[PDB]
Design a protein around this ligand. Structure first.
Ligand SMILES: [Fe+3]
Ligand SMILES: [Fe+3]
Ligand SMILES: [Fe+3]
Ligand SMILES: [Fe+3]
Ligand SMILES: [Fe+3]
Ligand SMILES: [Fe+3]
Ligand SMILES: [Mg+2]
Ligand SMILES: [Mg+2]
Ligand SMILES: [Mg+2]
Ligand SMILES: [Mg+2]
Ligand SMILES: [Mg+2]
Ligand SMILES: [Mg+2]
Ligand SMILES: [Mg+2]
Lengths: 172, 172, 172, 172, 172, 172
């Protein structure tokens, strides 16, 4: 047992490792999306920037969990980071929709982790999740919803005009 | 066939995708190393900062290869990123030795990529590898060797004093 | 033989004069395109500015090759600069498509020039081409492809709205 | 007929196209001259700079004419730009004498264009030529005459010392 | 074998040692030339400064090769630095001519080294030579040629006036 | 006989030339030492910086003697500069001991030069040696002794820790 460990259940430790993995996966999905918009045959530079920024943010999310794991005297164990589910993300709209789905999946995981932390009477871990993750998820999901809504209302994905103008005026 | 594609062999395109995967793997190994050093029972904060920096550098290396693939009109295909070979890196000295081994494996891959680009008379690709990668590897390898040497001569990994003082005076 | 000449094949020397001519020709093509967009019946001022910038860049590319010819002790022989293929470039999208084609033609010549320098074991000339020309071409080709893509997806050149908006938001 | 066209004779329009070609030609002559003085066996760097500056000015003279043609609703038609009459310009003195002859030839063209504009009662074209071109030509011709006179009086082009000191003290 | 060594042929190692020696020799030749112009019976202070500057640059060239040797895990072996071939360099012109000959000899050596690096499939070493040495040689040879040409055209070496004025206006 | 020459014995002139050679030799020994410390299997960057500084200082010492020779109207005759006695300097301690031995050998030579200048009643030369050399040697010798002493008392060359810590704390 680590000399620092106190009130940290092994199940919470193991779940924090799985969340680190999910954060690294979300980073990889966004990196994929970013470079999809960087293709010469897609060429939406502000979509590309947006998703790259998101990819770097997910890596910070992962790193803060790894720090947490050591702060609590848990031990990080890493697994493969699986490739994202698509290579071609189809359109600005379709990528935003997949991102929305991803953020809701990461949120579900965080809510299940918080439910475990509660059952294990770990208020430090509860506060960690609430403070650093849960409102970040709500804000992300809201933003992505707003983006989907505007793209759909503008006529996307069939209107390439819509996606060009959203790139410039919302993401730019 | 992409409208931008010119003098870019399918074999080179595939080789760039393998290289992207390896850069992302290298990022992952360093991220693992960094947080090993952040454990309470290891506690070498500058080893931790050093390897986190390397992790971020390797992500940049991957991103630049992704940019190149699109510049040349190739198509990015991402794969699962393999977990690192170790979960526990044993000591500062042993981490730096493994890092040296990693950078030589990445260099070898880049040298093989260059031989391929040479065979396919792709001077743009040769220059990209030279300009952005090959000297970066030579400097990384030499620095890691220098660190290994100092750690050994100081008495590591036997001397916890040695790793402490190297962490302060070299990596701090 | 010039007192400075060393390792500089006569065939290279002649190839360099042909390249000078082609860079001057590309400057003239871009000049022509620029002033087409300045017509009152076309009136896309950022297309005009974009192509004038490209014309001046190609003049600089020619001058750098002239400097190189003298650096190596070759002798410059200039020839008539041929008029561009068109007077009327039809639309923004069609001009961008013609420019892409021109940049791939220029790139092909440079690659043939590099092949010759490699066959003649002239690494100074290889480096000159790589350092100053090949990646400039790859960047210009990628930019033009991105531009063509955007204009297409916006609905050009049928859509005089698409070219107006691209002029403002991308080239502005 | 262009919607902007007013009081602009077809003969003047064609005369403007002829002037554009001649200004481009003059740009090319000066370009050739500049890089002759850059040769290792000539090596007069300020002669080289002086004629490059002149070459760029002539390009601006061409561009301003292209702008004028579109301002008036004429249509630009570009032609082959003929190579200069010499490859080797012999000396600083002899290049200055040929430049003097060039600027007088250009001035004669502009005077004929002015006569035409006068005959066609085109006061806007008369003023354009007077304002932007005729005194620029009188200034250029006086300077080149001054320079030839100094070179002669110093003992060029047989005195390599004369050209060296003129390069330093006048063109520097 | 050094722990850092990778893809570094022993023949390339040995050739880099010989180049270090040639760079140190070029430094010594320029030091000799410098102080020749510092003699009371020659007294051209700007020739003296010129060649001293060149002497210090050659030492930097040597040092960067020694750094390269260690970066690659080669081992520096030094030999005597032979005295330059003259004690009295005769004139400004004659020294510039000997310097030109020296720079062409150093360039030949670098081109032979690059040919060895190519045959040994060492693209790092190729890039090192191209990036840091080959254009430095071309520029040096061109400058020295230009200097010889002007001195000859001015009347040197028989005109001490020529050498005095070149000292002041070109080298000063 | 130089027009400036006064009270300057032929024996002193020859002795100054021997001294120039020895200063250049000292520069070369330090350059060797510096890059021994830059090897990956030695890796003491501040020992490397220290000895490179000394190398540059000794080149300045040589240059000032060359200036003196010309000031007094003597004639510089340069000789082959002997390679240093060692290729491998073994350790920080052993390098500093060899450096101490070198500086005493250079001092001895300067003291012999001074005895000669005294015998020949050349007070200018006596003052030059005193002013510019003798105290510089006494300070160099004392500093090197101080370094040797510290390295020995710390446990070098046995303790790689000792040389590490001296490199950081004294030479850094
Ligand atoms: Fe996240
Ligand atoms: Fe990398
Ligand atoms: Fe070009
Ligand atoms: Fe003009
Ligand atoms: Fe050199
Ligand atoms: Fe000294
Ligand atoms: Mg709270
Ligand atoms: Mg190459
Ligand atoms: Mg361009
Ligand atoms: Mg002019
Ligand atoms: Mg009037
Ligand atoms: Mg290169
Ligand atoms: Mg006294």
């Amino acid at each position: 047992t680590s000399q620092v460990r106190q009130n940290y259940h092994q199940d919470s430790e193991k779940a924090i490792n799985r969340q680190i993995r999910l954060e690294l996966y979300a980073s990889y999905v966004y990196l994929s999306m970013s470079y999809y918009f960087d293709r010469d045959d897609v060429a939406l530079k502000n979509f590309a920037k947006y998703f790259l920024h998101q990819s770097h943010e997910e890596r910070e999310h992962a790193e803060k969990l790894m720090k947490l794991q050591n702060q609590r005297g848990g031990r990080i164990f890493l697994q493969d980071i699986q490739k994202p589910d698509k290579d071609d993300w189809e359109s600005g709209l379709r990528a935003m929709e997949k991102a929305l789905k991803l953020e809701k999946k990461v949120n579900q995981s965080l809510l299940e982790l918080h439910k475990l932390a509660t059952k294990k009477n770990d208020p430090h871990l509860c506060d960690f999740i609430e403070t650093h993750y849960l409102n970040e998820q709500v804000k992300a999901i809201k933003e992505l919803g707003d983006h989907v809504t505007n793209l759909r209302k503008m006529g996307a994905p069939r209107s390439g005009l819509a996606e060009y103008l959203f790139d410039k005026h919302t993401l730019g």
